[PDB]
Amino acid sequence: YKLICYYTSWSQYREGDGSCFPDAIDPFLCTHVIYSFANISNNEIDTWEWNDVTLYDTLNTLKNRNPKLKTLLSVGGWNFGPERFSAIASKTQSRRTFIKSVPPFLRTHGFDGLDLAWLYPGRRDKRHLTTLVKEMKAEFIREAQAGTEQLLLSAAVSAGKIAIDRGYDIAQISRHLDFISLLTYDFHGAWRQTVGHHSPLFAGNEDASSRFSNADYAVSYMLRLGAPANKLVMGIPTFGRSFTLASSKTDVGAPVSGPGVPGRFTKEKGILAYYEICDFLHGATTHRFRDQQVPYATKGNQWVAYDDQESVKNKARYLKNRQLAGAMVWALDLDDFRGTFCGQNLTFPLTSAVKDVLAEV
Ligand SMILES: *[C@@H]1O[C@H](CO)[C@@H](O[C@H]2O[C@H](CO)[C@@H](O[C@@H]3O[C@H](CO)[C@@H](O)[C@H](O[C@@H]4O[C@H](CO)[C@@H](O[C@@H]5O[C@H](CO)[C@@H](O)[C@H](O)[C@@H]5O)[C@H](O)[C@@H]4O)[C@@H]3O)[C@H](O)[C@H]2NC(C)=O)[C@H](O)[C@H]1NC(C)=O
């Protein structure tokens, strides 16, 4: 069993305890840690933050304690225009240029693999995404010849039916990529005038419009398209999506007036770190879509949908029952890394819950 855990650069700058550095990551927790988002310039892979070489160093040092740990550098991200990927990958020149520039980067900085987080390729991009993957992987193979362990190659794919169907040639890309991460947590957003859970497990028998919008449908679908279960890792979010209620209505379908108030620490509308949610929860009312196996809280005109240890283990068993490669947790920085916000004196409570399940048979 795998546990792929992301670490995002921008989390350092958070204030108070919110600040987080690779420095605080428990070396034996996950099996794969992914530094989140490297840039691309002059078609070459490149750093982002002014101090990644430093933080790079600091994350890769964790392997001094856990030899089995592996680390990968992600490329792309949400604040990286999809166009920029498309532009690179449509002109063979740019593509190959980009590619031949990656292995040395990783070798130079201690990484064991590259991660492709091209956030949503288009209709016009499928044919080239297949290329990037192919060639990129061919290069990683030709470099093992130099007598070093072969660099890993993975990709974060959307879990949206349309999304996948629009820009993913799963069948192909699945046989090249060492593993595929399914972003099973973006099935809703403030862009929908009404309340909704973003990382539901099941379709839930009362609504029937977006059944394709749940981890189960996603998985079962990816399998159909051809991807094997030994390359699949299900995403598990460690944050929550919050809304500001446009009425006293709180039950399913209550109208939304817009995203939620920012977090003390995560400082950003619509989203909330687990540890922030832990504080929120106090004085809040907690419910749970028993149908879709996930909770939601409300306090005032603030409606929040999130994942708790329960819902998370729940999902964890799910992937075990479909025989998947492993689990993926989006944002360690978002978990209670210090373990002081969420009652129990446990560090990384959520990511642990999943580990403890996966550590089971
Ligand atoms: C991820 O990558 C991003 C793109 O590479 C990068 O953001 C950008 O990168 C550069 C800026 O560093 C940006 O370039 C310009 O934007 C300006 C307009 O707003 C233009 O004026 C500028 O045009 C020129 O480019 C020349 C250099 O590229 C510059 O010539 C010299 O450059 C030297 C210093 O830059 C200087 O020493 C020398 O004397 C030259 O003068 C020339 O003068 C002129 O100004 C660029 O178009 C990229 O376009 C922008 N990327 C895009 C496409 O949006 C991010 O920094 C990176 N992320 C992180 C955090 O690192």
Side-chain angles (χ1 to χ4, degrees):
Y1 285 120
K2 295 182 172 56
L3 213 187
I4 328 299
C5 311
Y6 273 95
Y7 168 77
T8 64
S9 280
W10 62 98
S11 64
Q12 50 187 298
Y13 309 109
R14 296 179 192 163
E15 69 190 60
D17 296 310
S19 177
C20 173
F21 288 85
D23 182 52
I25 288 181
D26 163 23
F28 301 93
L29 184 45
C30 311
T31 61
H32 296 79
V33 170
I34 295 183
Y35 196 79
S36 285
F37 312 141
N39 206 32
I40 296 176
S41 288
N42 324 148
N43 313 307
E44 309 206 304
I45 185 173
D46 189 33
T47 45
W48 196 293
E49 296 295 343
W50 64 284
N51 51 318
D52 302 301
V53 304
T54 297
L55 300 194
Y56 272 4
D57 188 41
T58 311
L59 158 60
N60 284 167
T61 48
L62 285 179
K63 284 161 56 187
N64 274 348
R65 302 207 270 143
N66 183 33
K68 280 340 212 188
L69 205 285
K70 304 262 200 176
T71 47
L72 295 80
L73 179 59
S74 233
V75 202
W78 287 287
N79 310 62
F80 173 109
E83 320 79 55
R84 316 181 67 195
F85 254 124
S86 177
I88 295 284
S90 312
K91 299 171 174 65
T92 66
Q93 226 60 283
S94 318
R95 192 159 61 216
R96 181 206 46 192
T97 288
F98 172 56
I99 302 190
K100 292 285 292 188
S101 93
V102 174
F105 194 83
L106 283 40
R107 258 58 239 251
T108 302
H109 289 288
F111 282 105
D112 307 280
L114 173 87
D115 182 59
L116 292 174
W118 183 348
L119 288 179
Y120 306 156
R123 193 234 269 165
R124 294 200 190 77
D125 292 305
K126 187 190 294 192
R127 172 183 41 170
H128 315 322
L129 199 180
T130 308
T131 307
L132 187 66
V133 180
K134 284 189 185 221
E135 314 186 316
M136 180 65 81
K137 183 67 175 306
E139 176 69 25
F140 279 21
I141 286 188
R142 192 151 51 274
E143 189 254 42
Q145 285 170 47
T148 68
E149 195 137 297
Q150 194 171 81
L151 293 158
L152 283 175
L153 173 52
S154 54
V157 180
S158 135
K161 199 282 188 311
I162 297 181
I164 290 173
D165 276 336
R166 172 206 304 173
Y168 293 111
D169 187 334
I170 296 307
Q172 306 270 43
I173 53 169
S174 318
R175 56 204 247 286
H176 292 310
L177 291 179
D178 287 317
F179 74 85
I180 309 178
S181 308
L182 265 192
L183 313 182
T184 6
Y185 42 64
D186 184 38
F187 293 143
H188 196 298
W191 37 286
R192 309 180 178 189
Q193 311 295 170
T194 63
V195 160
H197 207 299
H198 60 89
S199 61
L201 184 65
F202 294 113
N205 69 199
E206 314 245 16
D207 189 56
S209 165
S210 291
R211 151 103 159 137
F212 325 115
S213 309
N214 50 73
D216 184 306
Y217 181 91
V219 195
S220 295
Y221 189 48
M222 287 285 281
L223 296 177
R224 224 276 86 158
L225 282 311
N230 44 309
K231 290 209 178 175
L232 263 169
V233 172
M234 190 174 82
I236 295 202
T238 227
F239 54 88
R241 288 283 172 56
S242 64
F243 298 76
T244 293
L245 297 170
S247 110
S248 351
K249 244 278 201 128
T250 268
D251 29 90
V252 196
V256 163
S257 78
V261 316
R264 291 210 307 150
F265 301 72
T266 46
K267 292 180 183 178
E268 188 176 304
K269 316 180 277 160
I271 221 169
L272 275 171
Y274 183 64
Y275 60 84
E276 295 178 306
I277 287 181
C278 288
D279 167 41
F280 176 87
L281 235 51
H282 290 306
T285 296
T286 44
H287 312 293
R288 177 193 294 280
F289 307 121
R290 114 128 20 181
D291 225 23
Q292 324 157 68
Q293 322 273 62
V294 272
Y296 63 107
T298 297
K299 204 196 225 204
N301 56 324
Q302 295 303 98
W303 191 94
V304 183
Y306 62 108
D307 285 282
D308 66 323
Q309 292 180 69
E310 181 73 284
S311 86
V312 133
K313 299 197 165 188
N314 190 234
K315 299 187 166 169
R317 308 198 205 86
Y318 180 83
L319 67 268
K320 284 220 292 183
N321 288 313
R322 281 181 136 319
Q323 310 166 303
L324 304 190
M328 177 278 280
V329 176
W330 172 259
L332 293 166
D333 47 272
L334 291 175
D335 197 342
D336 189 22
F337 59 105
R338 291 174 201 287
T340 66
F341 286 81
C342 318
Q344 63 235 178
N345 289 70
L346 199 176
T347 187
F348 298 102
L350 264 41
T351 313
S352 302
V354 169
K355 186 193 179 193
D356 291 327
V357 177
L358 257 34
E360 279 174 23
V361 176

